[PDB]
Each structure stands twice: as structure tokens, then as C-alpha cells.
Amino acid sequence: MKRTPLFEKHVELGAKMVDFAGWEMPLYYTSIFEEVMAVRKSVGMFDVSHMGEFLVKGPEAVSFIDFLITNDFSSLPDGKAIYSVMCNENGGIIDDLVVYKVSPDEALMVVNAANIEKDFNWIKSHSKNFDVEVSNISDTTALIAFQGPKAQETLQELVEDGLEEIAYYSFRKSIVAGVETLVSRTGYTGEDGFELMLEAKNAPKVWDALMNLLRKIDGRPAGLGARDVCRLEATYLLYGQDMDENTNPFEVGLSWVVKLNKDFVGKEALLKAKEKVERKLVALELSGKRIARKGYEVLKNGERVGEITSGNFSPTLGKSIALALVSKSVKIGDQLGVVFPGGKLVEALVVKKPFYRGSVRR
Ligand SMILES: O=C(O)CCCC[C@H](S)CCS
């Protein structure tokens, strides 16, 4: 499996490993529960160096990105990032991503680990009519997520610049633990937090420095188990599970990242799709302790309406929770049935999204 520059640190910490998107990653160090509460009460640090980073440089960096993504990148000022999806000609979701507007001539794209190759090829195969050069800097770039209500107060003593000045989804170049870093107020937890992008060679040092500060405030390094629990509670999507090229943005609740007033790949397809949204992604709270898995059929009074996309147990709400792609007719308050292996039906209630909102800003 592929190993991030912090693999050795995870091994030393005695973490239980799991294969994620071809990477040997830490599922948890102590327990998924302990790590989730760390994110919810103080701070949890995640190694997300498996994520990819693409750099677009050139006079038409802005128009190129705007042509590729569904969201409005043309308006974004320097130092701002934006969440979005990148669609194919038929409006299917190729991947969701975050794009940083460094300057008129430079943009950085952060994409999912499993889609690095696919995304990069897609992006390169579309640079032809744009005065830009696209490069993949994933191989030498690390990314650390420092999340929690006490994330800012704990991280600040190692950062050369003021963090309070950095707004939600804003970023800046600074120095952390003596090394250059692109610090952003972003996250996948629903709490306040930051992500630290840095040269891979510097990952171990920054990580060690941060670990030292965590043991002081009862914080903890957190694995993928805790990462999934927190994002699901926050009701954030995971490409490959909650959506893929067979779903358009409107079907999974991402209408807000699609700006149809501009031209972009999949635009025409989406105009027609928007007129007939027959599916929606709903939040479910199941009875019992059994956890739903992707693919389990979802029923309404004995009739199928969809299927589970993501499932896990939320210690924050103390319930088995799930996301499910179902027919438009499903509404909040509905009583549904999730079919577990062996045809065993488990009751589930449709609830207003998101399940939980923490200290995350703006
Ligand atoms: O391995 C697991 O059990 C799932 C955790 C997946 C981690 C997060 S939810 C995805 C990274 S974008």
C-alpha cells in the first residue's frame, strides 16, 4: 500500500491500520470513540496526506478552474477557497474538491485520494484551450487537519501569524513549527479547525510539535474511523459512498455549489437535470445499535424508495445514523425500513439535516 510521510509516526503510536484508497492508514490509535470525543471537546489531529493537490499556473488559471467546476471561482478574491464538484458532460459527479485562489495566475486544487489519477487526467485533458500549465504536486505534499473547539487556541502558539484573522474557508501562507505552510480554516468535522498543507519532508516535525501540544489539553491524534464518524454527524459527503458519476449535484443536496449562470462542463446536462430532480439524500436515525452499510435497501411501507449510502454509529447523538439516496417523495418525519442481510428490516426515521453542528465557523 502507499504510505504517507507520517506512516512511521502512526506505527509508533500503535495505531490499528486499514487500507483506504490504496493507502496504509490509521483506523484509530486508542479508540474511535475516544478520538471522536477529542474532536468534539478539545482537538483531534488527522493525517490527510493521502489527499491530492494540483497546481494550475498561468494567466487563465481562473477561467480554467471556473470552466471545470460547478461553483463560481471567477469572483473569489485572493486568499479564499471554495468547495465544489467537478462534473462530466452528462452532469455526473467526477469528484468533490476544494480550490484555493492563490492569485490570478495560481490556483491549488485539493481532491480525494481515490480520484487523484482520474481527476488529474480529466483536468489535463481539458487544459488545451487555456493559457495554463497543470501539475500534480501530491507526491511531495502533506496535509494535516487540526480540528476541534480548542483547535485555534492550541495551534496559535506555533503559528507565526494570527489565526483569528483567517476567516472560514480563507487561507494564508505562514510558518508553523518553523516551516512554511499554507494554513486554511477548513475541515471535515463540523467543528472549528484548520488544515496545514506542507512539503512532505516537513510533516514529521510539524506533527511531533503538534502532538506535544495535544497531550497538554487532552487532545488526540485521530484516525479514519473518527474521521468518518465526525463527517457523517456533520452530514458531509464522501465521494464513492454518497455520490459518484451516477449522481448529479442536485440529487445529493449540493445544489448550492452549482452556479448555472456561468458556463462549465456539464452545464447543459445539469440545466435539464435541475428540472427533474427525482432523488434526494436524506439523513436517517435507525433504531438499535446495528450500523447500516452502503447498498442496504431502504423501504417505505414495504415499497423500496432507495438505498443506504453511508452508515455509522454517532457517539455524539448516541444513535446509529445513515445517509440514504431515496425518491423525492420521502420527507422528514417519515418512518422507513432498512433491509439488513437476511432480509431483516430495521426501523429508521428521516430527520432534518445535518445531524449535528459544532463550533465550525461561518
Ligand atoms: O475506513 C473506514 O472505516 C472509513 C473511514 C474513511 C475516512 C474518511 S470518512 C474519508 C476520507 S476523505
UniProtKB/Swiss-Prot annotation:
Protein function: The glycine cleavage system catalyzes the degradation of glycine.
Gene Ontology terms, MF aspect: aminomethyltransferase activity; transaminase activity
Domain of life: Bacteria
EC number: 2.1.2.10
Keyword Transferase: yes
Assembly: The glycine cleavage system is composed of four proteins: P, T, L and H.
Coiled coil (residue ranges): none
NCBIfam families listed in its UniProt record: gcvT, PRK00389.1
Reaction(s) this enzyme catalyzes, per UniProt: N(6)-[(R)-S(8)-aminomethyldihydrolipoyl]-L-lysyl-[protein] + (6S)-5,6,7,8-tetrahydrofolate = N(6)-[(R)-dihydrolipoyl]-L-lysyl-[protein] + (6R)-5,10-methylene-5,6,7,8-tetrahydrofolate + NH4(+)
Gene field: gcvT
Keywords: Aminotransferase, Transferase
SS bond list: none
InterPro entries: GCS_T, GCS_T_bac, GCST_C, GCV_T_N, GcvT/YgfZ/DmdA, GcvT/YgfZ_C, TrmE/GcvT_dom1
Record protein name field: Aminomethyltransferase
Gene Ontology cellular component list: cytosol; glycine cleavage complex
Entry similarity comment: Belongs to the GcvT family.
Biological process according to GO: glycine decarboxylation via glycine cleavage system
Keyword field contains Transferase: yes
